Amino acid sequence: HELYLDTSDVVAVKALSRIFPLAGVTTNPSIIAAGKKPLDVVLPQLHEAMGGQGRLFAQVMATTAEGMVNDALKLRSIIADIVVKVPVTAEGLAAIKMLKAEGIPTLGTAVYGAAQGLLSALAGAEYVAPYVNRIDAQGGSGIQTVTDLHQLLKMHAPQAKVLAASFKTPRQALDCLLAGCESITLPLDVAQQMISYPAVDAAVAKFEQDWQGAFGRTSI
Amino acid sequence: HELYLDTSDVVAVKALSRIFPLAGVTTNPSIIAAGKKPLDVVLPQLHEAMGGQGRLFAQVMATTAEGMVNDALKLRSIIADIVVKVPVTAEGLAAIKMLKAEGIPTLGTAVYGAAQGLLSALAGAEYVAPYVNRIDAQGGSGIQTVTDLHQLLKMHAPQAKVLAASFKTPRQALDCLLAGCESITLPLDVAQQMISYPAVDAAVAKFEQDWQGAFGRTSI
Amino acid sequence: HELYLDTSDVVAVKALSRIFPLAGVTTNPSIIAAGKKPLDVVLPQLHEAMGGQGRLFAQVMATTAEGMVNDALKLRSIIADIVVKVPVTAEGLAAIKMLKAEGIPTLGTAVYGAAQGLLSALAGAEYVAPYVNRIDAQGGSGIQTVTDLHQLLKMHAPQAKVLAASFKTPRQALDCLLAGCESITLPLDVAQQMISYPAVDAAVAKFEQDWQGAFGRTSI
Amino acid sequence: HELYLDTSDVVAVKALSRIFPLAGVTTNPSIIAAGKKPLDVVLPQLHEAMGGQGRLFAQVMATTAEGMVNDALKLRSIIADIVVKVPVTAEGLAAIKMLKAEGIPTLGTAVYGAAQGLLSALAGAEYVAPYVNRIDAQGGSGIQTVTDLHQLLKMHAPQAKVLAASFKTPRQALDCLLAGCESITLPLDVAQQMISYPAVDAAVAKFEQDWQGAFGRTSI
Amino acid sequence: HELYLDTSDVVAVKALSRIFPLAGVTTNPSIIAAGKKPLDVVLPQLHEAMGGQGRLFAQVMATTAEGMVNDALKLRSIIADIVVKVPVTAEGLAAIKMLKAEGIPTLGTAVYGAAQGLLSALAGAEYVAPYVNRIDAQGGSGIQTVTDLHQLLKMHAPQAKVLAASFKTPRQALDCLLAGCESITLPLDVAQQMISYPAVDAAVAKFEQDWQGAFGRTSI
Amino acid sequence: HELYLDTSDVVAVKALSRIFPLAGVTTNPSIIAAGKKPLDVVLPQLHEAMGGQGRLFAQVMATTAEGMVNDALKLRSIIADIVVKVPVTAEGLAAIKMLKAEGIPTLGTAVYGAAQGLLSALAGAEYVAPYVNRIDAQGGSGIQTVTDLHQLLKMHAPQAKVLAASFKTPRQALDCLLAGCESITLPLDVAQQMISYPAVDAAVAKFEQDWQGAFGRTSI
Amino acid sequence: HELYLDTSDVVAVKALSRIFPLAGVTTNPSIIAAGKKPLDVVLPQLHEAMGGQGRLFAQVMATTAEGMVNDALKLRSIIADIVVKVPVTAEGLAAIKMLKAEGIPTLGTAVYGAAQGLLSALAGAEYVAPYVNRIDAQGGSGIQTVTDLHQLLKMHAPQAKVLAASFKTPRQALDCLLAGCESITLPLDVAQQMISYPAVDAAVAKFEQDWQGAFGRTSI
Amino acid sequence: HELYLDTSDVVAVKALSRIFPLAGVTTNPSIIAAGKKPLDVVLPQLHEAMGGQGRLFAQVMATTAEGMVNDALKLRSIIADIVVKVPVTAEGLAAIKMLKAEGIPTLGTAVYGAAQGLLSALAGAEYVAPYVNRIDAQGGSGIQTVTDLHQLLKMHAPQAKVLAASFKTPRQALDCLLAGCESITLPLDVAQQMISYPAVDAAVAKFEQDWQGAFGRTSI
Amino acid sequence: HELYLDTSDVVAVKALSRIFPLAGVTTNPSIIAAGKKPLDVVLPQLHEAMGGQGRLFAQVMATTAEGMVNDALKLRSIIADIVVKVPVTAEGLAAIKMLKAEGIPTLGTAVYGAAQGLLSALAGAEYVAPYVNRIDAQGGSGIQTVTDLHQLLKMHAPQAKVLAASFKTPRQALDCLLAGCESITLPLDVAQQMISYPAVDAAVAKFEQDWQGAFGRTSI
């Protein structure tokens, strides 16, 4: 299994990388934009902030398949082993096929439907990223889409993995994981909620109180 | 998994073959007729329009088993490696057995029922093509038929594959894929709907707007 | 239950109204446009073509709530008892509330989600029209939406009815009916498929043959 | 609930009417033909063979709606209170609407699909008769069709009843009854199987043997 | 709900009638035979052993419908308000119809199938008695038969009640009750097991020990 | 719905009765014994500790039906409107029938099986108390037993209510409530757990902190 | 059904109240604090911003039952018909009972469990507000809790309603509605997402384009 | 998978063997009797009519285990590799054990129950033949018996196969195939129905019409 | 799979061992007692009555672990390869651990719960014997207990097998087998019922009648 953080926040990544068992960091154009640093700056910084290990992902911006391939080469010149995110559109699909032929690993992104996601895998994408909360927010079922997509990849393109993305609550992440998603990427607020519980803090406090009561201290 | 287009439209096939990850093209008599070009013209054209690679399918027309075998030889003389579609009737079954003995690969077509489809596979057919929308349109359940058929092939004739056909909406294709169909063939309109989503176009537009806002351009 | 035809084809409506048990005819801007006749022409013609009975529906075009209310008055001046279709957007919702206060019956249209549909009913809409095939085509589940929407209306706005729309195959219409939809509107090709079956024609032929065989004629 | 026999066998009807709690007898053109007696002979004979009580059904033969209405009048002139069976086709539907207006009760027959059946009820048919075994034999699911039809009538045309027909085995009848069918018609062989069980005969024999053993006779 | 004991054991009935909330006693020819007393002896004795209240059931022995009607009259002359058990066979069905016309309440017995049971109720039987363990012993599902039968009576002959019979274990009785059986009859060994539990006896002993421990006695 | 406390702790009852919406208090011989006060002392004290309102339950100790009736009279002489708990044994059942005739309301207790529980209700018991945790602890399913029992009462003795008892964890209580239990009795430790949650305390603390931050105090 | 907004944003409430069919506005201490206006200011402003109609909710801050009752009186003196939110703690429960006796309507809030919620309703609360996302975020199932709570209220305290709260995504709101929640409160971001869909905007644009194409304008 | 025909009709077998992919032919005493030819005549004829290939099955007639073994030797002397059908009775079980020791392959027949069928397999039978329609006709569930039996063989006697028999409708055959039956035997009327469909004939006709329309002929 | 008979009836074992495919015979103290022969007599007799092959089981009588080990040695001195049945109590568990260390194979018996059974397997027992009918009779679910026990062994102690015991009807045996029990032991009455069916005897009779009718004899 591969756990990613969905962020361009270099300081947070450094701090959270000693806590979480991270496989890497994912980015997209809105996440990069929000951080305000250009790709040739943030990407190496993000790579460093993880101890020079782990995988990175970043997205193309061009509209044509040829332009997307060129974007991919630019991305790869910044981070040699970077996975290239390609939106799963008509031109994106063509681009994914071209990048497969060139031996550059891709992720099929902006996936709102299971069949769409599958097509990106059949075209050669190694990862497929459904936008879970986007599908939920827009009146669908992000979890069903993810469930269906995982099953499709498993049956029809087993070299490919679901990389579930776009989350507002840990329940969504949990359901994706329960659906079998082999990778996932969490925004910072959801990741932090996933490791902080009032009930757990109360259990820890109780242990300290019981220890204190018997031994006259809270240390071992 | 094998993705086919269900068409005699050579220009569309050429254009769509750079976009979709196609295994080939399927035809039937109505699709050929609608295109108005004879078999000895369209078939080589379709083969070329895919970059001289991928599989082709075409259908016999004769009413007797012996006539169907002769039709198969005619088809094979046009395209050497072509898969011969045989309607799953009494004579069709007998023909499929004869073509198995002669080492010519067949597809059992015009399948409206699961048992019928299974018989064609037991007789030697390598592919079995239920008409999903035809079953749906005529008051049955195309998806249940496909689901039952796939299970039957898997348990009772595992060398054979379901090639799901006859579609009016992507939901039908998705359900066939979810049922485990190892091949599928899409008409052009459904294939195009499967790669074009307003929600996806909006997500792409958003990315461009965010990028523009931060970097003063929409390019990488 | 209320059965509608989804069409601006006056001749077809006349012919099909003696066959089907119709409650009326529904229209939308694309259907009106495709027929090329303006509203003040088609609407009275469609009303007549049904024997001066049954309900009509037509859609507003304006972008603001105030403009939509004015469109509604224009529609009502053409057909006095017409149900006004309002797209379920922010302004549409406001318009529906205003039209409720004015005593003009509405239908909440362009529904792609269950909650969206419910809101239109809570605002005062008497009908709610999900676009079944549009949801299917775009990678969702038109049937699940419809199922969820019907349940929501029944529990939370029981005065309102689902008017299921947008169909490419009878199976979709059947599933909406099975889900409990109290109204439905069919395009012409789907309606016609719903009353024409090879298996039924073969059963009728068989009856005639048996009768002939015993009685020397095919008449009673 | 209404139990019918599906037969033109007058002697069998007389014998079986003292055994079964019959509501009547149904016929169709193949059943009439097989008995070789004309309608003006068998019908009154069947009516008499039931003790001059119970309902009768018989089917029109004409191809046009007008011709079917005329066939209905001919049937009604033979048996005044007879229910007229109309195949659920385009013309049949129109005929059912006409016969509704004329106050002549109808049954919508040759039903191979649920929606088809529902339309016949919405048109005014009091009974709807799906051909269970015909649907089963032709690769579908007769029981699912019946199930779906019963639900549709109950939700959308509650004045109408399912009259389940076409049986090769009691299990089919049982499943229709379990699905809620408010009427049913059995052929003679199935009806007889439904009241004759080896296990039951063995239980009766046992009782007699035990009685004999204790009391020296098999009588009470 | 109606609870019966399935027995000809007069002494046991007297003893168990102060314990169980009995509606009556059922008998059949094997049960009468095993007790060795003739009907004109055991029946009045059983009636008395219940405090001159509650319902009795006994079974006919004749093979023809006419003979069964005569057996019924004989049974009624012994016990005026007795329910007559008629095996559900062809002649039994005819007999039930005749006894319905004569106003003598009947129970349809020796039921090994749900449809069979339903026919006896449609014919006029007030109770229908499936032989649960006989069905289980002979490789079927007694519980499913009972479940199906109850549903059939409820939907199709609601004046009639299931009187579940033939038990080797309390689990069978429980399941019949859970399936909604409005009456039941237990043999003595199963009834006794249904009120005697080691776990219950231990809970009672525990209460006495705790009481004794605190209050120095086991009495209140 | 009726919420009880399962206790002989008079001080706790007084304190908890201002917090919980109590219908009363239940006792059994182990609970009375543990409290060490005799029935003629604790019962009036418990009645008072609830503000002289609410229902009380207490259990007989005798082994014979007659002795149990006498115990019931003794209990009723202490608390005039008390519900008498009778263990559901052979003699208990007989006692419950006798008490029904005498117009003294009973509860059938020490219930470890559903059929057992039902027999107590048919005998005249107004409440039926399965020992949930006892069934769980002894390798069964307390929740299933309760679920089955509730259904049995509802179908077969609808005047009677399940009073679910014997709990070690709130989950058990929750599941009994979810299963439809119309009454329940909680021990003190489980009741207190049911109103005290770390997560809830943290939400309250958060509200106070936010209020303080904006308004400079924690009060309204 | 009752739709609320969860906010202290007066300007937003005014703007959104012409769009949504609102029953009122809910507040809690964190929402009030975040808006920075004191209760005696925001509450009347919120009331006005809804056209002087609809229901308001606000929460007590005190720690003791007596103090919470006093807080309630203070809230009622600001808004005469306001519903008082009481955290469901031990003291909160006591306070709810006291407020019931005083005829002041309450809502049981900070509900993290179904049984907890039920107790607040049994104590007299008219609404019960589970924190859906809080339960989801902290590793539980907000939807199951809501589902279980609704069923509990319906079976055991039917005068009370679920008012579902705490949302990060529309899917959560949808599932609560589907679970039968009779009231709901949405934060502004979720409410806005619930009425804005790319697919719907594309359908509207399409209608305008088709209209323009046929009629030379986009207006009616 | 193994497909058999259930017949003694030598001419039909010859004709149908070029159509169906047959593994052989099964017989039983009623099927042999109905054909009127003795075993030493029909069996070699049936063997020849299949092209001297495929498996044959025939049934013993004796009542004792020893007599059944002798019958088996007689059958084997007619057809050297014939599978011997033995009714699954007490003596039949003993016979099957004896034939296992002698190396003669058996089929356990006249199976009406799953446990019965399993015992025959544990005794050494290579095939087990439940009578599907016999179970259905006699008020059980043939499909459930088959389903249960297959699962029992797979878990407890995996060397053995279900050979499903006794059919009146293709649906039954389909359901047995869906349940996993590794072999099946069809009577001629069911087998013929399984390959002849009105809907399929209509699709073929349509293809010919379209071809004719474009190319001026119906041939390839 | 292993089929046992549960009996001390030497003559019956001899007779039934040529019919059933037996793995052996099981005994317990009640079964031995009922047969009245001491262990040193019946055990060798039972061993002989099976042709000197197959496994035997017998039970210890001592109360302490040490005493049970000594009982085991006594049993093993009578039958060298006998499996020793140990009741699954605290001392039994200790005994099973001791006997594991001594290399003497054990069966954990008197199992009324799944977890209890599992503990006996973890302690070293090779077989675990739940008392199915005992659990059923005492208000539990024997089948659920068996189902749960089998799963526990399979997951947690896979060297151990369920040996299902204690039966009053074949249905119970069937359901244990369906649950996956790898061994079973039947009492004689249930075993006999499992191979004797009225429906099967009628099918055999029918075959003989048909044969006779065509060939003038009932022999082959």
From Swiss-Prot, chains A, B, C, D, E, F, G, H, I:
Q: Could you tell me the EC number(s) of this protein?
A: 4.1.2.-
Taxonomically, the superkingdom here is Bacteria
**Thermal activity profile:** Displays a broad temperature optimum and is active in the range from 20 to 75 degrees Celsius. Although no significant loss of activity is detected after 600 hours of incubation at 45 degrees Celsius (at pH 8.0), the respective half-lives of the enzyme are 200 hours at 55 degrees Celsius, 30 hours at 65 degrees Celsius, and 16 hours at 75 degrees Celsius.
Q: Which reaction does it catalyse?
A: beta-D-fructose 6-phosphate = dihydroxyacetone + D-glyceraldehyde 3-phosphate
Annotated localization: Cytoplasm
* Keywords per UniProt: Carbohydrate metabolism, Cytoplasm, Lyase, Schiff base
Task: Quote the record's note on pH dependence.
Answer: Optimum pH is about 8.5. Active from pH 6 to 12.
Gene Ontology CC annotations of this record: cytoplasm
Q: Which CDD domains match?
A: Transaldolase_FSA
Q: How is it used?
A: Is an interesting tool in chemoenzymatic synthesis for the construction of chiral complex polyhydroxylated sugar-type structures. The use of hydroxyacetone (acetol) as a donor compound allows access to various 1-deoxysugars. Can also be used for the synthesis of a broad range of iminocyclitols, that are potent glycosidase and glycosyltransferase inhibitors, from dihydroxyacetone, hydroxyacetone or 1-hydroxy-butan-2-one as donor substrate, and a range of acceptor substrates.
Q: Name one GO biological process term.
A: ketone catabolic process
Gene3D superfamilies per the UniProt record, alphabetical: Aldolase class I
Q: What is its main location?
A: cytoplasm
Q: Indicate how activity is controlled.
A: Inhibited by glycerol, inorganic phosphate and arabinose 5-phosphate.
* Top EC class for this record: lyase
The record's active-site residues are K85
Q: Which GO terms describe its molecular function?
A: fructose 6-phosphate aldolase activity; identical protein binding
What's the stated role of this polypeptide? Catalyzes the reversible formation of fructose 6-phosphate from dihydroxyacetone (DHA) and D-glyceraldehyde 3-phosphate via an aldolization reaction. Can utilize several aldehydes as acceptor compounds in vitro, and hydroxyacetone (HA) or 1-hydroxy-butan-2-one as alternative donor substrate. Is also able to catalyze the direct stereoselective self-aldol addition of glycolaldehyde to furnish D-(-)-threose, and cross-aldol reactions of glycolaldehyde to other aldehyde acceptors.
Q: Which family does it belong to?
A: Belongs to the transaldolase family. Type 3A subfamily.
Subunit structure, interactors included: Homodecamer. Five subunits are arranged as a pentamer, and two ring-like pentamers pack like a donut to form the decamer.
Under NCBIfam families, the record lists: fsa_talC_mipB, PRK12653.1
Task: Read off the HAMAP family from this record.
Answer: F6P_aldolase
Q: What is this protein called?
A: Fructose-6-phosphate aldolase 1
Q: Which organism is it from?
A: Escherichia coli (strain K12)
Gene behind this protein: fsaA
